[model samples]
Target chain A: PSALTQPPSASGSLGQSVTISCTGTSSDVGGYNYVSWYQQHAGKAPKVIIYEVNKRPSGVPDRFSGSKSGNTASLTVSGLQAEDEADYYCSSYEGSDNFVFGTGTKVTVLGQPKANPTVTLFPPSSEELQANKATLVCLISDFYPGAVTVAWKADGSPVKAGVETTKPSKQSNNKYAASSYLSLTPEQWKSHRSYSCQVTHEGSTVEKTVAPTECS
Target chain B: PSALTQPPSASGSLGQSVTISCTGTSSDVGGYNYVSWYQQHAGKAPKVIIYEVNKRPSGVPDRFSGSKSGNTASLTVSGLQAEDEADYYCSSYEGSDNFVFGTGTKVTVLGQPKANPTVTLFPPSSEELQANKATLVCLISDFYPGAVTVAWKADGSPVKAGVETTKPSKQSNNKYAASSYLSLTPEQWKSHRSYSCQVTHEGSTVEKTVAPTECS
Candidate 1:
């Protein structure tokens, strides 16, 4: 079966409402009531806000509602907040142990902050160095508007490979955090004394540089 | 947010085994145990076969298993059967009321098919006809190997709209059944005399036709 269909992005102002649509056929959404909606901040796991098409799971705010008409299901976020800016996804239970998800939709809250994120670099532990495996973590935190770009560099040149980045995820207090991992061998780690993690957001750039001493 | 990564297909022969992989980051699958696997037959809703990494919901067979290592999660179907030929999907719980799903994987079981589907058409009841709305149901049942194609035709031409088709779902005695609906206005229903529902499996085709006289 094919994945469900959804638009790429949605937006609304603070206190306004926005609806994200998910379309499927009778074998999935139209056939049953088992449609669900999820919200994902960048770099975080997705949580089920609405499930079984119109029922909100326990603890989900009433501002989030779900509904279906024929083959199309919908999620409507009312009274949108700055914290509501995230990716939204829909899923349906196809028969016989199968499920499918919509592509995803980004919910943008207009006029939200273009704030720059704080950056931190953590070197791989000593145990990792002994095993000839090195991993560097770049943590970007406390960003508003939840959209930012992260990159890594060694000695002024861009590090292109062996990097894994995460989507911005929600923090405990409604801020967002994202992380990127750069893997290196022990040989490369020892040879490099200048490494930097850079984050770009809202026309501002923040960089955290780590010298060889930081690895110890 | 991006969906989880998975291969497009996997395969195994009868009595053998096959495994499908879903890869995510530490913010999702690798960080949490809330991973689930789903199995989907053609044109059907998915059923959760394995959830929470390795726990099978009640009534799911023991042949299906799930596991996770590092940033990747895997679903294994041991002792594969011809009936297992279908699509598989993986889902993970992102944080804070969010979720993500893998693209999808088709599991092909070599060597299949024997029985063809039986088709039956049920026209709308007299009460429904009196309401200026007409609904027709096409029920296809008693199929083996669990794969078939369904189509609707109005007076020998293809039906391009106003039809909803279902995936073949498993039934008792190891058979399968699927249904399709054709909705029409009363004027259109009275004007047309022939409606056919067709089921195609292997090289065989079976069609069940109904006319205006059958509406009562």
Candidate 2:
């Protein structure tokens, strides 16, 4: 167990409010006023945002605030700005000069444009049957906000047992690319049954299906 | 395309023979006697084993030999010794002091004991249903020789789709660990069906099946 814990991530729209909570054990933060908050941008050094539990540094912006109640310390971002997209860390001071930093939280400010992801479904390799498994690749690309839900279906029934979709990875062109993998036995694949991948993005569902007719 | 292409890996038992081939274009190894082979052991500087296509370095063993035919250069190890377990790299001279090294290959002298891998399968988290996909992880640990085949089945049927297995990773305890992942949808998982992960090692198969009936 760790002495300090924090939310893994949080997000809010521009001008909205988002708060990250950090919890500490009694010996570290519950009985004292020793929580500190630090903000780090990509590839930059950490800068203290709030110190002494609730006080912001003199040079820091007032939009960033910190508060502590019992064993939980919190950093609040009001009027979330685009530049506020950074990782935040909270620290605690225990007795005898021992201190532990809380797990960092990535705070994202979300006001990006909405672009539907394009879906492409590929069939399994022809030689996969020899190894006892077949694989299908569902590629999703050119999306924003990087949040989507993917599902699988076979022969019009919701296929649950072998679908894995990855988190969206940022592409070099500033869009996002993700993939979903569906596993099936070569028997099922060669049966000429229809397999489908459905991607739900921005309240709309995009589905692609493939059926192989030629087993030879 | 590269000027040189070498085998990714090769292996042989002690007292046997093994050979690695490096293919090059006509401007390199095919037209001249400029192929050189270097041997590198872990944490040590590389030593030239064979140079100028057929000549062995004076300090090197005669058991190591090199040859070139057409676009392919080769390094052959006869009477494979235990100390010959290393990475081999071949280089070519592309004229005018220009040169390129082939992709390295790891040569292993295999004579280790066989050990079976243990298996532990974990179910998907309860909250996975909200995201439209579920995941099952099969963990394999404490194995030797680092080769195993993993397969999944649902209700005694082979699962070829949605099955992914990783290569064996060496553990600090002198054994190996590998993992296989099975993907499912929440609807199928909640039906309380049977799932099995089968691992084949050393001519035997170890299987563990989980029939989930409890929804909670």
Candidate 3:
């Protein structure tokens, strides 16, 4: 299946709300609330600010929120602050143990009345439920400040991708970690066939995946 | 929501597998893979070892693993080494801003293979549907380690308790980060209430909680 996609940047005013859209299908974001959001500064551990949609972690300011309907899941950041200016990622777990990342959205603070930022997920490619084996491409696009790595796992086993890939952008706040493209034939995506995609940014791991649906 | 609980310390032989069980409720573990595991030494920031349950982060030795069945999530370390001696925490996203922690488990190399040190969670508490005040607690009975902190949240908002809470001890390898008794007397619990408890240790957060349920 194709990975979810998002814009590279978004700008909003202080105390205003803005929204970013992630495009995918039912096979990725539609089946469940496995989606989550993360925030990162230049050089710090990533903090999970939102998960399973709109719920925020404890101590998180009320300005941050999430919501989903149909093939889209949205994250709304209200009453934005200067500190909120950072790289943001929208993620959803594939049932097979892999994750899909939306091209990260960079929150830019404009001087207008701060509008809440919203994120949307598009329908995934191929709703065809491959009961056995399925192939997934973990894509990290439009990374702000840097490149990101993506890794694929099959049945909990790591596939041989090239080296520990790291793309460092000389631009300020522009480095990311992503995995080489992972290929699994349709035969490999059967029941019990599982895979995972893991992304590391600023020394923190954010992961998601797809799992075989249980037989009734 | 309540915190997940586990033994503070376990002694086991090197090269053997030691399993740590994190116990909580359906609200915290069900339909949610927000579950993650972390390892922390004395003063450094916690590193992501296992995330989304069983998937280990890049560079994490396969010796460390995670699994969840029902309300219990388990982390197992195989081929343990002396350097593996540290604390482990399990975390999951409950609804709202509530992220919860499991009472942490500290691993000790017993130097002998015969000592099978395993950690377990006690039976979780259950309650009937009601529209009035309610309280839930997550407790750890033993561990010899450093002090532990317990925090509570409601609908993602930090909820303060009327009574003073205590900290875990470091003298015995067996200690507890007893979650603050959560009091939900507001009318929200009658409809869309959610709560959680989190334990912070050496920069790691382990937590668990009951999912929000409608009062029947």
Candidate 4:
């Protein structure tokens, strides 16, 4: 198994209930429930929302939560506010320095639009690819609000995929970069056709997607 | 920007120089050299091998180092050993639970097999991800070393190829759950295809597919 588990994306209206799921194999999330959650807005770094699987961080609100069942884990943001739109991830301790993230999901703020809406995404790059069965790249960068998501597209469509890759980056005043890879094949890439990148943010109504070429 | 700067898997002889890169955007890694590195041996917790952008963490051997240039962050582990066949991660403080981690890289110590040789990865889920727009979850559990990574693969490929997302989950008993939600048009869902829930751990891989369900 990889490291983290989660749903791709979810939606909800203002003041409604939004549930995000994170599942893990037997190694991390399934073996324990020491999960944590963070939130990011456009042009800002991520903020800690939930920790210890269900406990809120020092300064986080009760709107965010963490939960787990068997090998599956989940995070829920209640009272979904317009400012709650963005990307989310689930993580757990695998061994030592290794930490895992879900595919990532974007939360959209349904209802009225805010003056400063935010959007977020993941694998923020286009160079991400799968080479043979030995290589797979999970690109994550160019994030606004510091929180976003990443997914695979098959000829402009989404699909179920696997391969475990992880990477981390330095710190900056605005954006950051962290990436991973999985080995696939040229035929696989061509069969998949094209890929897309998405971002979700707070005060935003929709998530953002970019082409692999645009990722550069 | 290649999805990964390093090979998904690499092997090195003891005492050899091995460098792992943590690629990110300028917002998180550029202009900020406060990078750190960690190591994790099989079944053991992660230990800080490098800190403060190249400085060794407390008790870390002089063989480990962390460096950065612009948007790229790197971790070098020298004088490798068979015990060094563990995962590694790069991390840096980004203010307010905005600490970032690179996708994990496994460091395998080659030559001369020792009884229970210890390997390690850095940034070992010591910090936390903040919550506001989204959450960041760190999954570290019972993976006994092998092929594993952190990524968002919607359906069968990769998600947002070169993007990043958040909504991480908090930790509990050393485990966590994380997630994100996105508002997609029915057209987008059809075109985007199905998403997946994946995890790599315990020398095994697991995944689940998700698309526009009955709820959507």
Candidate 5:
């Protein structure tokens, strides 16, 4: 893979087409026919799909096709499927006896059982408030594709201390769940402040908030 | 509170006695009679129990008694009750215009719903393994106090990076539960090695091990 650039993401619904672009200097992708493209799925090793600028390697599917113009190479998935969700990267021979790779593009084949996560925020227990500390729990559950980003807010602004979160865990119901913890001082917990947890997953975001008297 | 030092923890069963010591310089506990001890339950405000070195405050129970010898002060719970599980700290006049506090000691009244947590470790889902990452989940449940330490081991050695844990969440049965996660690379996930989750709760530790094929 020579020094090349590509968009970080591309998306399409089932039965639709999606194209990812990879760009490089003229000395590489534009001047040489040694351009190649690779596809990778979750945790799987990368496999060559397109080689010699636009030819597929043996056994690679016809749905995975490639083309090039000037210094940019393109990989086009003819029809998006559930298993088509993967990362794609382009590589080109630089003529110095080596090759360079693109920055990688994540293709999302959307709308297949896209379950949204439910958010629940729990305030500190009364016993915890009496002990001079508070721990707020944000439980996120029942989501597909467990990857998501979580954030904590104090009184409508960002807060940054004593926050911890776990990766999504698979449930018996075939869904993903995660939990986030926010630690606060007793004074802060009792001071009529609003604390919230925000989670972004699968192109949607959900937030839940808690107050001092909520748990008591 | 004056400059005093105290042990971090003390424990005793029901009907047993536990004494917490607060040590200070001569100018504090020895030279002055203005020492006081405070009792604090979880999330509850600290309440002054003993004043003037050995006198109980009004309405404070007689079970919480105080005494001092030389530069050291002490608060003794003659017969511990379930409600007496608390944090105890001492304060003393430093002969200046202000006072200092002890380092604080947590006294546990044992055998009152002291349930040890159960540990269950789940290997990464095959889908996640196929996606280029592995996430291990360690679920801790049914504990009373809801506090613990979790560590991860790869091939019996400590492994850091991509480890996360949440504070205990109160369950419907009044017990507490928590979850921990460990992230690994695909190569590490496929290697013929053992990964384990170690949980320490309530004076005991329970660990669970998983190999690469545990999920597949």
Candidate 6:
């Protein structure tokens, strides 16, 4: 079995519709009726929307539909909303209990920003200091329209290495949230004295800072 | 994001070795190191054998090794045994919680004829008949060295449509089992006095039969 083929990106404005394609050979998608489509927000697990080619599982909105032709399968999102801006993936069941997933597609919603994200910095715990290591989390939440960048700085200098940033994922309230992790040795962290988390969105920047005294 | 590429089939004789390949682009497999491999016998969910490229998870055998190059990843199975004959799949993280899976590969073990499967036919319950429909289940269990074929027949004629057969999945004791379903309308069920489930393996055939007296 081989992976199915899918495009890298798909886009649409609010109230518009968009379709994504997944192609495979006769031994997989074309030969079997087990094609499925999934939706994924950043930093979240993929959720299946369509299964067995055209059947939608319970609770899936009717605005999403799937179809297939020859060796190609398709997923169409009707009346696209800002919430629909995310990545999409497809999968097909190959014979012998094998399955293949398509690369992914980023679905961008074209519009202006509605709200800026709020950033909070959480310092390392006392237990962490005992281990000679410190872990800091930069939490970004309540953003609208979904695009934002988070960066870290130590003592006014940009820190690039040893940083893990999560994708902006949708939250229960239809807003988005993201987190970034920064790891440093206890000595390195204490020497810095000043650490900051910077969030950029809609041409504006927001900075949140934390000092050593706040950590303990 | 795209799926990883792999061959359709790989084979090795007893005590021999075999290798399977998975290829992707710089954006996924070639770019990051979160690659995983899974082993699947028919009708069962996949189990991860190797994760994070070369690191094996707990309980995985030493015979399974993984490696990666610029844009390709590989899994090698050394000292192949009769139990190694099944399907293999690979997965790679494509950033931001998105993942791509390789097509799949079937591993064949050469020169062996093992235990034959036992077949049992179960008729539909009374509740199913009340809906004007009938579903018949053919359970094929305890097979070893794994290859088998299952077919259905009504009376003396072969059944060509409305049949669903599952892949041969591995059982707890290292044997394999599969199930086949035959659906029919109440009228068709009444018209056909006898139905049989036939299985073929290693040049041998076994069957189980059922009639109206056995069903409610």
**Candidate 4 displacement at residue A39 in angstroms:** 1.2
Candidate 3 lDDT tens digits, B32-102: 77678756443223455777787776557867778778788888787876567777767777876666777
lDDT of 2 by residue, B89-189 (tens): 78777665345677777888777457998665555543344556666656665688678888898877888676656556454323556666676787777
Model 5: how far residue B157 lies from native, Å: 37
DockQ scores of all models, one per candidate: 0.03, 0.02, 0.03, 0.03, 0.02, 0.02
- What is the lDDT, from 0 to 100, of the residue A85 in candidate 2? 85
lDDT of each: 0.71, 0.68, 0.53, 0.47, 0.69, 0.70
A1-216, model 5: which lDDT tens digit per residue? Answer: 335866644668878888878887777567666677767554332456777878864656788879888888889989888788886777665533243567666677664465777665655545445566667666666676555567899888887776766556565556667777666788887776688899877458887776656332
Give the candidates in order of lDDT, highest first: 1, 6, 5, 2, 3, 4
**True-contact fraction for model 1?**
0.04
**Comparison by lDDT, 3 against 5, better one:** 5
Cα RMSDs, all models: 27.9, 20.1, 25.6, 19.3, 25.9, 23.5
TM-score of each: 0.41, 0.34, 0.34, 0.35, 0.36, 0.40
The number of residue pairs in model 3 that clash at the backbone is 87
Better of 2 and 4 by lDDT: 2
Model 3's TM-score against the true structure? 0.34
For model 5, residues B116-153, the per-residue Cα lDDT tens digits are 87665665644355667666666666678868788988
C-alpha lDDT (0 to 100) for residue A106 of candidate 2:
69
B191: Cα error in model 3, Å:
78
Model 2 residue A104 distance off true place after TM-score fit, in angstroms: 1.4
Q: Distance from true position, residue B19, model 1, in Å?
A: 6.2
**Distance from true position, residue A183, model 2, in Å?**
22
Candidate 6 has a DockQ of 0.02
TM-score of 6: 0.40
| lDDT (tens digit, per residue) of candidate 1 on A1-216 | 777888887888877788888998998898978878766554233556888787776567888888679899889988886678777878887776566788788887876655678666655545346656766666566677668898899888998676656556455435556656566787788798778889998889998876656323
List residue ranges in candidate 2 displaced over 4 A. A111-216, B1-216
Error in Å for residue B141 of model 4? 38
